[PDB]
From a paper:
DNA gyrases are type IIA topoisomerases found in bacteria, archaea, and some eukaryotes (plants [Evans-Roberts et al., 2016] and plasmodial parasites [Dar et al., 2007]) and are capable of relaxing positive supercoils and introducing negative supercoils into DNA as well as performing other topological manipulations. Unlike eukaryotic type IIA enzymes, which are large homodimers, gyrase is an A2B2 heterotetramer formed by two [name] and two GyrB subunits. Here we present two different oligomeric structures of [name] [name]-ΔCTD forming an open dimer complex with a 44 bp unbroken DNA oligonucleotide.
The Dihedral complex, built from four [name]-ΔCTD open dimers, was obtained by mixing [name]-ΔCTD with 44 bp oligonucleotide and ciprofloxacin. Initial negative stain analysis showed that the protein formed a complex with dihedral symmetry (D2). [name] analysis showed that the complex is formed by four dimers of [name]-ΔCTD in the open conformation and linear DNA threading through the dimers. Calculations in Relion 2.1 imposing D2 symmetry and using particles where the DNA contribution had been subtracted from the images gave a reconstruction to a final resolution of 5.16 Å according to the 0.143 Fourier Shell Correlation (FSC) criterion. In order to model all other protein subunits in the assembly, symmetry operations were applied to the dimer, which is the asymmetric unit in the Dihedral complex. The interactions between dimers in the Dihedral complex are mediated mainly by contacts between the N-terminal tail of a monomer with the N-terminal tails and WHD domains of adjacent dimers as well as WHD-WHD and WHD-tower domain interactions. Interestingly, whereas the Tetrahedral dimer monomers are related to each other by the point group symmetry, the Dihedral dimer monomers are not related by the point group symmetry and hence are different. For the Dihedral complex dimer solved with D2 imposed symmetry rmsd values for bond length and bond angle are 0.005 Å and 0.888° respectively, with 92% of the residues in the favored part of the Ramachandran plot and 99.7% of residues with favored rotamers. Comparison of the [name] open dimers with the B. subtilis open dimer show different degrees of gate opening, with the largest for B. subtilis and the smallest for the Dihedral dimer.
Numbering used by the authors:
A (entry chain B): 6 to 486
B (entry chain A): 11 to 486
C (entry chain D): 105 to 232
The structure:
C-alpha cells in the first residue's frame, strides 16, 4: 500500500499538506479576508472588462474561462462562491448581480448552472484598479507563465465589515459584520487622532450588524468581543402582540437573526404543537411574504401570550446565541487582533498603496519629462543640429556629437532624431513648453505630497466621504441593554 | 408586343447560350469555370500550402452567383478534375474522382483541392488593370467577363457542347506544338495549312487512340467540319498454346470499358462466336490491360473488324467546331484562334505597359519632389519657423519652388533621419533608374516587334518550366 | 405555418416553412424498381430527372390546371372522384358506351367551396 519509509518527506509533505489546506479555504487575510477563489473571480471579472455598464452575460462560460486560465481545481466551491457573492441577503454587501434561480432564504439552493447569467456590482470600482499600479507580486501557472496576484489591495476596509466563514480547516474563526457609516466615522477619528481609547470609539461604533435586522440586548459581550473577539451574545426577533377587531391577540414576527430558516422553524413549531409542550397556539400562518415578510402565530384568549414569547426565546431557535471568533492571520502566521490593530494595518497598507502609486506616476512624469527635455534642447540650437545631420554618418557619430554638445542620453538623442516638419510650428513648440511646465508642476506637487504624510489621510477621508455619499448606509438592527 | 416577345426570345436565348453553351474565343473558358478559378485565386491560399477539404469555397461561389444548382458547380469542379477526360491540368486535388469507368463520388466537400500550377501563371496580372469588370446582381463584389491568358487553352482542352442549337466537338492538342504554332504565326503572317500540319501533326488525348485518316483532318482544320476515326490500340501476340492474343491499351474517347464489354458478351451470346470465353480485362491501375484471346480455328482480325462494326473499338468521332465571340457564333478555322489570341495578348501587354508607366511616372514625380527638396533645405526650415500652419507651410513652399500638393506634403513628411546626403545620392540613383525604365517602356511602346518578343519570353518561361510529348500515338 | 385563409393575404413566412406531405403520393408513384420513365442528367450531366409522372390514377385530371399566359390559354376545371371512378370503370368493362349515358354517371364540374349550378347546355358543350 503505502510502504513509505522516509519519515522526513512524510513530515515535509505533511507540513505542505497542513499549510496548503489552510491557504486553500477561507482565511482571515490582511487585506480582504477572502478565499483566494474570490480573488480569482474578481481579477478575472476585472481583466475581462465585464462591467455592469455593459449588459448581462452567461457566466458559466466565464467560470470555465477563469478555470482554464487558472489551475484545474474542482467546480464545486467555485460555483458555490459564485452563488454566495451573488446572494443579496447573506452577505451584507453587493458583489455579483445575478439574474436567475436561487431560492430566497428557505433552504432551497437553486443551482441552475445552465441559467447562470449575471453581471457584477459597482463596488469593485472602489475595490481595485491596479492596472498601472505596481502593487502586488504574481505567481505563474500553465508551465508557469500567466500572472495571478497574491493579495487583494484596496482603499477600503469593506471586507472587514462583510464577514468571514473560515471554520473547519484547522481551528475555527469568522468575521461578524457591522455597517459602514459609523465605521468610516471611527476610522477617520483614529486617522486624525492617533491616541484615542476603545470605549470612546464604542461610543462611535454600534453593535455588530445583521442584514435582516436583529434585536440586540446586553453590552458585556460587546465589551468582551470588541476587545478579544470571543463570546456569544443574545439576539431576538422583532416580535409583537397585536389585537384584532375581536380582541384576540397575535404573535407577529418580522424577521429573524442570522442563519435561520422559516420552514425548519415552522416544522419545529408543528413539532411543538404535537410535542404538546406549549398551549394556546391556534393558527400558524404565513402569506403575502414577497411584498414584505409576514409570519403570524395566533393564540386563543386566556393564555398569557407574553409568557409564551418568553417560552419562545427560552426554548425555541428564535432566540439566537450568536458567537464570535476572529482569530486573525497576518502574513501566513495565525494571530488575533483588536479593532484598532485591523485599522492600523489598513492605514499602513494605504500608506504603501499611495506611495507606490505616486512613485509610478513619478516615473511616468520623469520619463515624459526627459522626452520633453530632449524636445526643448532640440529646439535650442536647431540649425547647428541641421549641420550635424548634414555632416555625420551613423547612429554612433550622431549620438557622440549630441552627447558632446548637449549631454543627453541615447534614447533622448534618438527621440530628438524622430522629429518631423509637422511638429515645427512655434505653436506646438510652446505647447511642448507649456505641457512640459505642467508636468513640472505635477512633479513638484507629488514631491510636496512626499514631503508630508497627512495629505494621504486627507484624500482618503475625502473619498471615504464620497463613498459614504454614494453609498448611504442607514441602520436596520436594534441595540438594547 | 410580338416584337417585344421576339426581344425576350433573343435576349433570353443569348442568356442561356452565353450561360452554359460554348465560351468565348478569347479564353475558351466557360464562365462557371472562369469564376471557379477567379474565386480560387481570390482564396489567395497558395498551392504550396496543402490543398483544402471544404465546401466553403463553393459556398463563396454560390454567394457570388445563384445558379439552378451548386451541385452543378461541384460537377464542374469534378469534371475539371477528370484528367482522363479534360487534359492537363486544372485541379490540385486528393479526394475521390474515379476514372472513365462509371464512378460516382458522392463525397462532395470531402475531396481536397486548391489552385493548380498552370493556373498560377495562367491568371496573373489582375493587379495591372488588364481586364474589365462587371458588378454582380448582389451589388457588392465584381467579376471579370474574360481572362488573361498564357496559352490558347482552346486548343489545349477541347469542347463537348450541348445542342441548344447544335453541340460542338473540339479536340485537345499539345503544349509545345501550340507554342511552335504561336511562333510560326508570329514569324509569318503568310503560313499555310501544311505549316499547320507541321507544327501540329495531330490532335491528341490524355488516353490515346488511332486516327488513320488524313483528309478528314484536312477538312477539320479548314472547314471546321468532319469526322475522324478513333481506334483502340491492337497488339497481336502469341499464346503458348497457339491463340492470337489481342492486347488493347488505347480506346476511342468517352468510351467506358464496362458497357462495351457487356455488349461484347451479348454479341457472343446471340448465336455467334462463343468459343471466345477469354476476356482478361483487369489490372488497369498500372495502365490498360484489355486483353482477349481468340479461340482456336478463328482469326483475330475478323473479330477485330466485327468489333469495329460494333463502333466501340473504332468510332466515327465528328467535329462541329463552333465558337462564340462578339455575341455571335462562328464556324472555326485557324488564323482565327491564332490572331484572336495574338491580339488579346497584345491588349494585355500594352495595357500592362500603360499601367506600369502610370506607377513609374507617379513615383518619378515623387522623386522629383524628393530631389528638389534635398537640394536646398535650411532656408525652407527657417521659413517654416516663420510659420505656424501646414497650410501656411504649403503656401510657403508654393512661393519657394514648383511642387505638387502631394509633393509639398511628402516633403513635410521628413523626420531628421531624412537630413543626410548619402540618401540624396540614393534617391538620385533610383530616380535616374526610374527615368531610364520609363524611357525603356516608351521605346517599347514605339516598337511593335518588342511585344512579340515579350510573348516569346513568356513562352520560353513556360517552356523551360513545362513541356509535354504526344502520348496519343497516331498512325495515318 | 402561416398562410392566410382565403382572403388575399398570402403569408409567405419562408423561415417558418415547416411541413410534411399527404398520403396520396403512395397511390401516385412507386417507381423504385419499376422500369417506367427515361431520365435527363444535370450537373455536368450526371444525376437523374424523370420525364413524366406516371400513376395508376387520373387524380390530376380531377384536380385542375392553371396554364394560361404562356401562349394560348387553357385550364382544367375540377370534378370529384367517386362518380369519376364509376364512369371510368363503366368504360373499362364497356368499351362502346355513349357520352350522355356517362353524363348520367357524371355530375357537374365540382368546386371545393360548394357551388350552386344552373343550366346544362354549357355542360353539354363543355363535356364535349
Amino acid at each position: 500500500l503505502v510502504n513509505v519509509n522516509l519519515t522526513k518527506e512524510m513530515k515535509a509533505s505533511f507540513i505542505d499538506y497542513a499549510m496548503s489546506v489552510i491557504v486553500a479555504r477561507a482565511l482571515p487575510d490582511v487585506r480582504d479576508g477572502l478565499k483566494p477563489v474570490h480573488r480569482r473571480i474578481l481579477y478575472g471579472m476585472n481583466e475581462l472588462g465585464v462591467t455592469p455598464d455593459k449588459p448581462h452575460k452567461k457566466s458559466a462560460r466565464i467560470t470555465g474561462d477563469v478555470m482554464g486560465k487558472y489551475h484545474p481545481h474542482g467546480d464545486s466551491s467555485i460555483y458555490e462562491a459564485m452563488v454566495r457573492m451573488a446572494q443579496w441577503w447573506s452577505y451584507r454587501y453587493m458583489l455579483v448581480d445575478g439574474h436567475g434561480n436561487f431560492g430566497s432564504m428557505d433552504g432551497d439552493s437553486a443551482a441552475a448552472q445552465r441559467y447562470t447569467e449575471a453581471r457584477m456590482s459597482k463596488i469593485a470600482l472602489e475595490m481595485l484598479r491596479d492596472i498601472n499600479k505596481n502593487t502586488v507580486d504574481f505567481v505563474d501557472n500553465y508551465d508557469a507563465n500567466e500572472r495571478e496576484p497574491l493579495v487583494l489591495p484596496a482603499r477600503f476596509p469593506n471586507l472587514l465589515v462583510n464577514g468571514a466563514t473560515g471554520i473547519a480547516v484547522g481551528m475555527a474563526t469568522n468575521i461578524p459584520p457591522h455597517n459602514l457609516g459609523e465605521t468610516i466615522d471611527a476610522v477617520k477619528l483614529v486617522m486624525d487622532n492617533p491616541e484615542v481609547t476603545t470605549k470612546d470609539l464604542m461610543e462611535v461604533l454600534p453593535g455588530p450588524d445583521f442584514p435582516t435586522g436583529a434585536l440586540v440586548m446586553g453590552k458585556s459581550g460587546i465589551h468582551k468581543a470588541y476587545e478579544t473577539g470571543k463570546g456569544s451574545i443574545v439576539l431576538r426577533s422583532r416580535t409583537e402582540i397585536e389585537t384584532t377587531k375581536t380582541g384576540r391577540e397575535r404573535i407577529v414576527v418580522t424577521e429573524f437573526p442570522y442563519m435561520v430558516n422559516k420552514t425548519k422553524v415552522h416544522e419545529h413549531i408543528v413539532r411543538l404543537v404535537q410535542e404538546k409542550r406549549i398551549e394556546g397556539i391556534t393558527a400558524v400562518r404565513d402569506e403575502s411574504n414577497r411584498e414584505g415578510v409576514r409570519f403570524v402565530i395566533e393564540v386563543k384568549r386566556d393564555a398569557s401570550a407574553n409568557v409564551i414569547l418568553n417560552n419562545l426565546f427560552k426554548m425555541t431557535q428564535m432566540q439566537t446565541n450568536f458567537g464570535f471568533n476572529m482569530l486573525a492571520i497576518q502574513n501566513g502566521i495565525p494571530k488575533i487582533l483588536s479593532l484598532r490593530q485591523i485599522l492600523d494595518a489598513y492605514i499602513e497598507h494605504q500608506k504603501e498603496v499611495v506611495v507606490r502609486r505616486t512613485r509610478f506616476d513619478k516615473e511616468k512624469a520623469e520619463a515624459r519629462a526627459h522626452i520633453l527635455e530632449g524636445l526643448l534642447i532640440a529646439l535650442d540650437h536647431i540649425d547647428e543640429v541641421i549641420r550635424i545631420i548634414r555632416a555625420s554618418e551613423t547612429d554612433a557619430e550622431a549620438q557622440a556629437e549630441l552627447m558632446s554638445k548637449f549631454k543627453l542620453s541615447e534614447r533622448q538623442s534618438q527621440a530628438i532624431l524622430d522629429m518631423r516638419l509637422r511638429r515645427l510650428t512655434g505653436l506646438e513648440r510652446d505647447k511642448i513648453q507649456s505641457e512640459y511646465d505642467d508636468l513640472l508642476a505635477l512633479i513638484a506637487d507629488l514631491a510636496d505630497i512626499l514631503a508630508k504624510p497627512e495629505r494621504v489621510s486627507q484624500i482618503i477621508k475625502d473619498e471615504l466621504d464620497e463613498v459614504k455619499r454614494k453609498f448611504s448606509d442607514k441602520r436596520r438592527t436594534e441595540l438594547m441593554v
